[PDB]
């Protein structure tokens, strides 16, 4: 881990990407007021209570996080941006800004790609929220990279996700709508369960936008969920 | 700090192996002082010989050492014996025993033998001393911990040969002048160089200051090892 | 898999193999800075790449704000560079509580050479796969430019250049003061040395830029700020308009 | 300067019978000249047919009671179930009081 | 070739297996549980005639109501044992009673898993039989592995004859069996198993009665059931 | 987080060498070539400046460094090992003896401080050994001038004259020929001169040189002037300006 | 903090840092005790590689730990002086807690526990030392002889010899002890201390060493004469036709 | 890409896998079988427990964590018992903190993060033991399964250890069934223990054999053993 | 309170202490010995605060039997008294202080001289032909500057001492149930047990 390969790469790094790309497909979408979130959860069994095994985390009131790989490596993680943003509020008063909030997790996935006694973290992870001006959407990866995104995908169908993601943005430069953003993730989540379907799914969307959650991040339930499952099972058929 | 199948200790082993390559000393015990001599590693025309000093250490006024191995890994135990000395006579107003602070310092090198994953000293050395309960002594210890003493003992380079022929030599009712020669003598013939010169030396005695009834020690300047070298019949 | 091929102990040769790759990271993300100092004022630029179109090319940057004053700019990867970067704005910071004047740019870069020598002696610690140059107007040295390698070394600069181009980039400079004669760019307004900055930058990687391609930073007199895309475009309309 | 203590009243009485025992406490809660609570109880039952009453400071009263309530639940998980004999929670209460011998729990207690 | 607390594909720690394999080189101790009090027993295995079989001490009191045999490396025992009489003192001192057989072993068990803040290199060599009374569950034995793992049993054997014996102790042991009886048959697998002759020298009983606590049988009294063994196996 | 590798990185090997050590010599070999000469009056310590394009600006880069106001120091090998050295050499001579005996400390006992720092990185846990060797001249009341070398295990030894890194073999003979026991300072720049011509290959100037001396007091260099006790430090940098002087009658 | 652990099992269920610590004490220098009815004596040898050594400031194979015990030993010098150190603090410790002095048992005890601590701590090899403790428990005539092993392990001997070639001389020992009459005098202990030591030395000179202990404190050590008249009495007395 | 990558928990193979966490995982399968199912009234666990000789224990598997609360283990006990002793401990705190019984969900997470720091200290192992926990809070019935790679999930029933598929198969086929079986207990054991039968090479299920908790609306935690098991035989 | 007399003769040093142990209102025991045997010829005398007082003593005890047995050598009275003051130095100083002040009366062999050292519970020491601790002092010190020969023998150093417990029964207020007396020479440390009604 704290060695370089010759081509100047850190090979441990490298091969947690490998994890990520074994994991299932998460999204996030940014719209004109907010952010929405979605991920794929694999019904291993017909045994599994449905809606009852949540993987979509809050931070604070205001940031959510998604991410695909080992799910206990993205639980430590979020535990330790919620330490974060907690001492971030502590002192200096006001909810953490998203960039900010961005590299706090940064500087931490980082950390554990510098030394030998250490392993990377073995996700990816998207999350985002709004702040004091405006909506945020970042990806981070187990190299500690990070960027502000406009779509963003990771998983097994991380390729057709970006390619529909792709076709949003290039087909909506006025803006998406957080209501918009939010059957547009379950279509694309449906496409990209196309890449890992020996298996079915169950589909989960939260959101955090100002005119329709006033800024918090909140879970997207009930009709609006369904509405969502309606529009993506439409446009698959 | 491993044992072998056979049971003995790797880094101990090859650290008398490192010693056994380093400038050669001896330590000869008279009924009246101490001898102790010590060869330079391969010197130079332009290393400094006034103001140098390597093998040759004051650790109290009563007490010397001579180094064979790591000149560096020896002022680290040169230094902590030096203090070690001092926390004795403030503890008691009295002077170390010699074999006190031998023991100690083997004890120190014990140490590094059975914990903590650090290398032993690569150093082995020869204690000339005085104490009253024991008169002169001469002691040798090793990267191993271990410690004895002896009427003329040799370090480093060649002890075979210097061993040989201090036995050859070397007598019980000796003064203090044939030791020195003896010294030498044991020196010219297992040196590597072409002949045994003054810079090429470190030359200590221990006696009984001449006229007093207390106890001297004498680090011979350049000149008087020069002077010494010339008396014996070697010039 | 020979030990002084994973962690920093010498090799035979007495070589450190960790650092030698370290290096080699510098160059992956296959961007291009250099740096120059006018009359008055210090200007880094470096090619801004965003492949992909999902990107908000806002957040893609690898200059940073270390304090009022200075300026930095890195070659490597970017979590290596953020890493970097709080470190020196937290020394940076603590300097001024400390000693009560600002930090000056070459004791940061020293300072900034010394963390990274250290990873080059200790095991637990890789080297960070960057390269840091530091920038500012010195309140008494003057424009300056100051860089660190992941060997721990660093010195002093009248311009240079780092990247996987860096030899065209500094031979090109060379030759330019080789004529002009003198160590700076003699021009009084900022808004020139980026001009001239650019215009040696396109020369030496036969490439022309458009306001997106390109990332500008300026020292000042007690600023040191980043250009906009619009600032930029500004400055590429006047060089079309010459060259 | 602060004062780490307080006296809530109170008074509790325990008498044992042949095949039975009580403990009575009043459930009136006291600060100076003022009355807190006129039903605050302080005699508890605390499982394994024990009943408990820690009676002076309220606070330190409430603590020991908690930790001796834990301690039976502690004994249970340990133990493998076993009834904790009054002998033996006694033995143990000294040991809870005992371990503040140098900042006290400002109570009286009956079992 | 990597570590101390490993696991192998097969999903056992390997120091912990190896440490198993150390207390099969050990001396044998048998164990067996009766309605009117525990047995244990042990072979001496002196190394050498000169070597004082008094002196070989692999049965111990941890209580008056708990006792011990062990077998493996048996100086690794000394810091379990020390640890044993501890907590059933301990236990006495916080709660005006005796501790359970259970819990003691237990305790035993937990200082076991110290080993990789966990200060201790590697898993103890030695098994342990610990055998007592209390009120609630009456007469108990249990084996204590280095693992943490222990195990209530009937009868239990371990060391070196522990194969053969376990089988031995499968047929003869029944839910009626006296405290005579019992000593009688530990003596008889111990005949068995033992490379040597058994005599009262280089085997030791003992038991632990409600009535009497703990007794460690002395050479006079142990010769006596050897020379009735012996007899009762004669007629048959 | 924390530190692993606790044990020795330098261990014996079966033929009782000390690995590290001898790859840190090695290391040392590569080094640009740097020499100390001793005088009567005087010790001069110099090098090259080998400028790495001519856009860097060498006079920022410290080779040739004060430690004391009468002892400098100079190296061969990893320049960042030495840079980092310095500081802890120039604190140490505080720490360990100004701020107990209000004066700094004699040559030979900074040196014997900074071979201490030497020694540990050759013993101590998770760490190499310094890739560099230092040369270290001084002067002190009660010793004069002196010069020694320090090597990556913390050995050090006293020279009359002496050279360290590329071109040495060459140069300490050079010097053999040219060292008299009566030479004035001004003498020991020139020899130090004419030595370093042998081991430069492309311009030999006074901004590719960095020489400096342990003379005489230098008033001018204190920075006040009451109290006639002392008059100054004994090192000084030669200016780029005076190296030039110096090579034109060469 | 170096705690990697050394001492560790192999897939046969051995220690092997242990197991070679044995091979160091098989290595030193031959010691041997044996008791008789009212003492115990202990005695050891001298290598022979150097023999310009001083005779008087050379540490003696035999260490008083209290004034009525002592410690022989196999194995590493330098290990051997460490556990020698702790058994004498430990000797005091007692004397002040419980206002006796240590019974030999428990200072075996003592030492044993010390070595075994030792083949169970990361980042420490065990002790290169095989021990043998002997003397008399304070106000008792029954005389005690303890050995411990680097493992940890310690048992009483009617007689016992450790180091090299102890397994001729544990031959021999077998052979002559015997339980029902041990050797009944000071003198007649010598004897067969001298004799099971004769088998590995070569000469009786600078090499064998005696020292004998009777009870109440009683610790004489033997000069070179004295073992000369066991030395010379038995060569040419048990040589018969 | 088997070779040098199973030596510690904080190396990943060029696969992306963790192979002492994959052979920690393996201790399980050589574990004795455990069946976890739920109504909306109750939960229950059945274990069936190991012995090692005719002779002995058959080895405790169920283990009470709270009055709300308990757990079976399948893999290394020691294990178990530095789990659920942190999980007592857990349940301990939110009721002297906060005066409120531990929901099921956060002991799941509790568990999940601290099986997670053991897949990635050096030096340190992962928990080699499975564990099924069931409890009823202020939101009904529940059953979680553990896996000492630190996943945990709910459900309305599942199996754990040597042969779990079997009894897995048969509570995926009975689901609609169980879940049913509301304010019934006797009628929810039953189907728990026809369920672990599914799961038996071994026989005949004994007094001995068998080891049943249950906690629900009204009843608290309880463990049933030998006597008390013998009518669901 | 507590009396502890030294005296140093020709070829002895001789201590007196007093026998009572008092707490309060009550004699406790009136046949307590309030000295320590160092080493054979080294003996040392004490008085102080109540639990302070032995387990000093002891703790020296305990030290210099463990040099003896480390090196079969007897320290000098000078070693032992330079001991003993560090380890009352370095007490004074810490959070809580020996309050006990000693008599250390030796015999140096190699020397042939009787040495007595007077060290207070700050680590105040000092070498005396004769010396006391406390309040019993006022009285001896000007006694003793009267009655006392440096060439004295010991019978003669027994009847200086006489005198010098005769006067302190007269003029000290406190019932002090006699001394035990303890005579250091070259034949090591005997006691006098018959002082009381002699």
Not at chain 1, 49 to 54: L, T, W
Not at chain 2, 172 to 197: F, G, N, Y
Not at chain 8, 82 to 108: I, P, W
């Amino acid at each position: 881990n704290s060695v370089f390969s010759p081509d100047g790469r850190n090979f441990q790094v490298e091969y947690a990407v490998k994890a990520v790309e074994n994991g299932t497909t998460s999204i996030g979408i940014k719209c004109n007021d907010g952010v929405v979130f979605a991920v794929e959860k694999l019904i291993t069994s017909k045994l599994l209570v449905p809606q009852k095994n949540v993987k979509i985390q809050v931070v604070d009131r205001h940031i959510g996080c998604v991410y695909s790989g080992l799910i206990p490596d993205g639980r430590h993680l979020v535990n330790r941006g919620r330490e974060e943003a907690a001492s971030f509020k502590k002192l200096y008063k006001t909810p953490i800004p998203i960039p900010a909030f961005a590299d706090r997790l940064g500087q931490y996935v980082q950390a554990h790609t510098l030394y030998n006694s250490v392993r990377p973290f073995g996700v990816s992870t998207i999350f985002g929220g709004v702040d004091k001006n405006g909506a945020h959407l970042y990806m981070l990866e187990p190299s500690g990279s990070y960027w502000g995104y406009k779509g963003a995908a990771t998983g097994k169908g991380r390729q057709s996700a970006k390619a529909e993601l792709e076709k949003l943005v290039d087909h909506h430069p006025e803006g998406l709508s957080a209501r918009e953003a939010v059957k547009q993730a379950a279509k694309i989540i449906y496409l990209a369960h196309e890449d890992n379907k020996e298996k079915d799914f169950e589909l989960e969307i939260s959101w955090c936008s100002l005119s329709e959650t006033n800024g918090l991040h909140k879970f997207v339930k009930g009709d609006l969920l369904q509405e969502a499952i309606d529009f993506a099972q439409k446009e698959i058929n | 700090t491993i044992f072998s199948p056979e049971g003995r200790l790797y880094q101990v082993e090859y650290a008398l192996e490192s010693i056994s390559h380093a400038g050669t000393a001896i330590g000869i015990m008279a009924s009246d002082g101490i001898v102790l001599a010590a060869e330079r590693k391969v010197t130079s025309t332009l290393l400094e010989q006034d103001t140098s000093t390597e093998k040759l250490y004051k650790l109290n006024d009563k007490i010397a050492v001579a180094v064979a191995g790591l000149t560096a890994d020896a002022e680290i135990l040169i230094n902590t014996a030096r203090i070690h000395a001092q926390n004795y006579l403030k503890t008691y107003n009295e002077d170390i025993p010699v074999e006190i602070l031998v023991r100690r310092l083997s004890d120190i090198k014990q140490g590094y033998t059975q914990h903590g994953g650090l290398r032993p000293f690569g150093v082995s050395f020869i204690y000339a001393g005085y104490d009253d309960r024991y008169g002169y002594q001469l002691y040798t210890s090793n990267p191993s911990g271990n410690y004895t003493g002896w009427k003329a003992i040799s370090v480093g380079a060649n002890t075979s040969a210097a061993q040989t022929l201090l036995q050859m030599d070397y007598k019980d009712d000796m003064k203090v002048d044939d030791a020195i020669e003896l010294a030498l003598k044991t020196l010219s013939k297992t040196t590597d160089s072409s002949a045994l010169t003054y810079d090429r030396l470190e030359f200590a005695t221990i006696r009984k200051g001449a006229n007093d009834g207390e106890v001297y020690q004498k680090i011979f300047k350049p000149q008087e090892i020069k002077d010494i070298l010339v008396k014996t019949g070697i010039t | 898999a020979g030990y002084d091929r994973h962690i920093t102990i010498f090799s035979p040769e007495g070589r450190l193999y960790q650092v030698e790759y370290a290096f080699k990271a510098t160059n992956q993300t296959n961007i291009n800075s250099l740096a120059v100092r006018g009359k008055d004022c210090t200007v880094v630029i470096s090619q801004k790449k965003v492949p992909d179109k999902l990107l908000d090319p806002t957040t893609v940057s690898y200059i940073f704000c270390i304090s009022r004053t200075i300026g930095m700019v890195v070659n490597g990867p970017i979590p290596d560079a953020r890493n970097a970067a709080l470190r020196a704005k937290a020394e940076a910071a603590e300097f001024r509580y400390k000693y009560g004047y600002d930090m000056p740019c070459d004791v940061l870069a020293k300072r900034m050479a010394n963390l990274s020598q250290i990873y080059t002696q200790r095991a637990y610690m890789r080297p960070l796969g960057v390269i840091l140059t530091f920038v500012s107007v010195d309140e008494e040295l003057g424009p300056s430019i100051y860089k660190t390698d992941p060997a721990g070394y660093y010195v002093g600069y009248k311009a240079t250049a780092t990247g996987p181009k860096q030899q065209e980039i500094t031979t090109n400079l060379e030759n330019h003061f080789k004529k002009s004669k003198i160590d700076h760019i003699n021009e009084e307004s900022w808004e020139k040395v980026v001009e001239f900055a650019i215009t040696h930058m396109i020369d030496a990687l036969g490439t022309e830029f458009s306001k997106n391609d390109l990332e500008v930073g300026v020292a000042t007199k007690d600023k040191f700020f980043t250009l906009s895309a619009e600032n930029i475009e500004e400055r590429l309309v006047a060089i079309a308009e010459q060259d | 300067q602060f004062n780490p203590y307080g006296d809530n009243g109170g008074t509790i009485l325990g008498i044992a019978g042949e095949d039975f025992a009580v403990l009575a406490g009043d459930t009136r809660n006291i600060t100076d000249y003022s009355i807190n609570s006129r039903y605050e109880p302080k005699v508890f039952d605390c499982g394994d047919n024990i009943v408990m009453s820690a009676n002076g400071f309220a606070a330190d009263g409430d603590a020991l009671v908690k930790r001796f309530k834990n301690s039976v639940k502690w004994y249970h998980f340990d133990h493998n179930d076993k009834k904790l004999s009054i002998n033996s929670a006694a033995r143990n209460i000294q040991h809870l009081l005992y371990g503040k011998r140098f900042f006290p729990y400002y109570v009286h207690t009956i079992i | 070739d990597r570590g101390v607390s490993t696991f192998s594909p097969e999903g056992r720690l390997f120091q912990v297996e190896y440490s198993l394999e150390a207390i099969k080189l050990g001396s044998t101790a048998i164990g067996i549980a009766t309605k009117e009090g525990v047995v244990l027993g042990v072979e001496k295995r002196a190394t050498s005639p000169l070597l004082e079989s008094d002196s070989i001490e692999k049965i111990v009191e941890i209580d008056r109501h708990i006792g011990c045999a062990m077998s493996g490396l048996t100086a690794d025992a000394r810091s379990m044992i020390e640890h044993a009489r501890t907590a059933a003192v301990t236990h006495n001192l916080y709660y005006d009673e005796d501790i359970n057989v259970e819990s003691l072993t237990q305790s035993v068990c937990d200082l076991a898993l110290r080993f990789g803040e966990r200060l201790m290199s590697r898993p103890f060599g030695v098994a342990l039989l610990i055998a007592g009374h209390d009120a609630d569950d009456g007469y108990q034995l249990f084996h204590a592995e280095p693992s943490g793992t222990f195990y209530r049993y009937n009868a239990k054997a371990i060391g070196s004859g522990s194969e053969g014996a376990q089988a031995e102790l499968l047929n003869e042991w029944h839910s009626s069996l006296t405290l005579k009886e019992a000593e009688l048959l530990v003596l008889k697998i111990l005949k068995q198993v033992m490379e040597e002759k058994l005599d009262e020298n280089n085997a030791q009983l003992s038991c632990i009665t409600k009535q009497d606590g703990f007794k460690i049988y002395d050479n006079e009294k142990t010769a006596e059931l050897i020379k009735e063994l012996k007899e009762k196996e004669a007629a048959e | 987080m924390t530190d692993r590798y606790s044990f020795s990185l330098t261990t014996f090997s079966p033929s009782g060498k000390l690995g590290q050590i001898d790859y840190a010599l090695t290391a040392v070999k590569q080094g640009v070539t740097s020499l100390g000469i001793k005088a009567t009056n005087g010790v001069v310590i110099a090098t090259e400046k080998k400028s790495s394009s001519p856009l860097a600006m060498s006079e920022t880069l410290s080779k040739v460094s004060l430690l004391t106001p009468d002892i400098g120091a100079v190296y061969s090998g990893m320049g960042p090992d030495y840079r980092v050295l310095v500081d802890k050499s120039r604190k140490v001579a505080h720490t360990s003896y100004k701020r107990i005996y209000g004066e700094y400390p004699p040559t030979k006992l900074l040196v014997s401080e900074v071979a201490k720092i030497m020694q540990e990185a050759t013993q101590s846990g998770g760490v190499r050994p310094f890739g560099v060797s230092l040369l270290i001249a001084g002067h002190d009341e009660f010793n004069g001038f002196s010069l020694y070398q320090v090597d990556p295990s913390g050995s050090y030894f006293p020279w009359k004259a002496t050279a360290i890194g590329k071109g040495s073999v060459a140069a300490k003979t050079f010097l053999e020929k040219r060292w008299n026991d009566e030479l004035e300072l001004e003498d020991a720049i020139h020899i130090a001169l004419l030595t370093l011509k042998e081991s430069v290959e492309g311009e030999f100037n006074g901004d590719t040189i960095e020489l400096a001396i342990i003379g005489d007091e230098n008033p001018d260099l204190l920075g006040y002037t009451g109290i006639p006790t002392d008059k100054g430090p004994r090192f000084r940098k030669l200016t780029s300006q005076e190296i030039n002087d110096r090579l034109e009658a060469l | 903090g170096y705690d990697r652990a050394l001492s560790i099992f192999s897939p046969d269920g051995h220690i092997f840092q242990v197991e070679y610590a044995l091979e160091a004490v098989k290595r030193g220098t031959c010691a041997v005790g044996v008791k008789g009815k009212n003492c115990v004596v202990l005695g050891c040898e001298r290598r022979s590689t150097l023999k310009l050594q001083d005779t008087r400031i050379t540490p003696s194979k035999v260490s008083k730990i209290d004034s009525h015990v002592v410690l022989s030993f196999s194995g590493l010098n330098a290990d051997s002086r460490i556990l020698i150190e702790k058994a004498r603090v430990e000797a005091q410790s007692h004397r002040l807690t419980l206002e006796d002095p240590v019974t030999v048992e428990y200072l075996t005890r003592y030492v044993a526990g010390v070595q075994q601590r030792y083949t169970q701590s990361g980042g420490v090899r065990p002790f290169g030392v095989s021990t043998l403790i002997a003397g008399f428990d304070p106000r008792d005539d029954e005389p005690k002889l303890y050995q411990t092993e680097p493992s940890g392990i310690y048992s009483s001997w009617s007689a016992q010899t450790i180091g090299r070639n102890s397994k001729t001389v544990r031959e021999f020992l077998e052979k002559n002890y015997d339980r029902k009459e041990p050797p009944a005098t000071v003198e007649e202990c010598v004897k067969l201390t001298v004799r099971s030591l004769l088998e590995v030395v070569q000469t009786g000179a600078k090499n064998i060493e005696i020292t004998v202990v009777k009870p109440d404190s009683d610790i004489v050590a033997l000069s070179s004469e004295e073992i000369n008249q066991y030395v010379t009495q038995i060569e040419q007395e048990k040589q018969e036709q | 890409f088997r070779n040098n990558y199973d030596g510690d928990t904080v190396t990943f193979s060029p696969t992306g896998r963790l192979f002492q966490v994959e052979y920690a995982l393996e201790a399980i399968k050589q574990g004795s079988v455990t069946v976890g199912l739920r109504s909306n009234t109750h939960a229950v666990l059945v274990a069936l427990k190991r012995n090692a000789d005719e002779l002995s224990s058959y080895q405790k598997k169920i283990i009470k964590c709270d009055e709300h609360m308990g757990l079976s283990l399948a893999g290394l006990a020691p294990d178990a018992r530095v789990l659920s002793n942190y999980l007592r401990q857990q349940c301990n705190y939110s009721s002297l903190v906060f005066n409120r019984k531990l929901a099921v969900e956060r002991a799941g997470h509790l568990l999940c993060d601290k099986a997670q720091k053991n897949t990635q200290s050096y030096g340190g192992r992962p928990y080699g033991v499975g564990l099924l926990i069931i409890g009823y809070d202020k939101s009904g019935a529940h059953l979680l399964e553990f896996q000492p790679s630190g996943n945990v999930t709910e459900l309305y029933g599942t199996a754990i250890g040597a042969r779990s598929q079997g009894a897995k198969t048969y509570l995926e086929r009975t689901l609609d069934t169980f879940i049913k079986i509301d304010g019934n207990p006797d009628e929810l054991i039953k189907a728990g223990v026809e369920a672990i039968s599914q799961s038996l090479r071994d026989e005949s299920l004994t007094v001995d054999n068998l080891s049943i908790a249950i906690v629900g609306k009204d009843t608290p935690f309880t463990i049933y053993d030998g006597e008390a098991v013998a009518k669901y035989i | 309170m507590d009396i502890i007399l030294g005296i140093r003769v020709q070829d002895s040093v001789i201590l007196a202490s007093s026998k009572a142990v008092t707490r309060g209102i009550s004699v406790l025991k009136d046949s307590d010995d309030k000295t320590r045997q160092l080493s054979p010829h080294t003996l040392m005398s004490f008085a102080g605060e109540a639990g302070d007082t032995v387990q000093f003593a002891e703790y020296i005890q305990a030290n210099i039997q463990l040099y003896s047995i480390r090196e079969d050598y007897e320290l000098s009275p000078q070693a032992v008294s330079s001991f003993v003051r560090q380890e009352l130095a370095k007490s004074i100083r810490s959070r809580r202080p020996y309050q006990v002040n000693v008599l250390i009366g030796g015999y140096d062999k190699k020397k042939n001289k009787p040495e007595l050292y007077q060290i207070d519970y700050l680590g105040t020491k000092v070498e005396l032909p004769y010396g006391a601790h406390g309040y019993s002092g006022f009285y001896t010190f000007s006694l003793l500057d009267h009655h006392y020969r440096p060439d004295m023998t010991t019978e003669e150093g027994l009847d200086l001492l006489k005198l010098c417990v005769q006067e302190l029964e007269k003029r000290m207020p406190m019932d002090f149930k006699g001394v035990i007396v303890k005579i250091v020479d070259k034949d090591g440390i005997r006691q006098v047990d018959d002082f009381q009604a002699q």
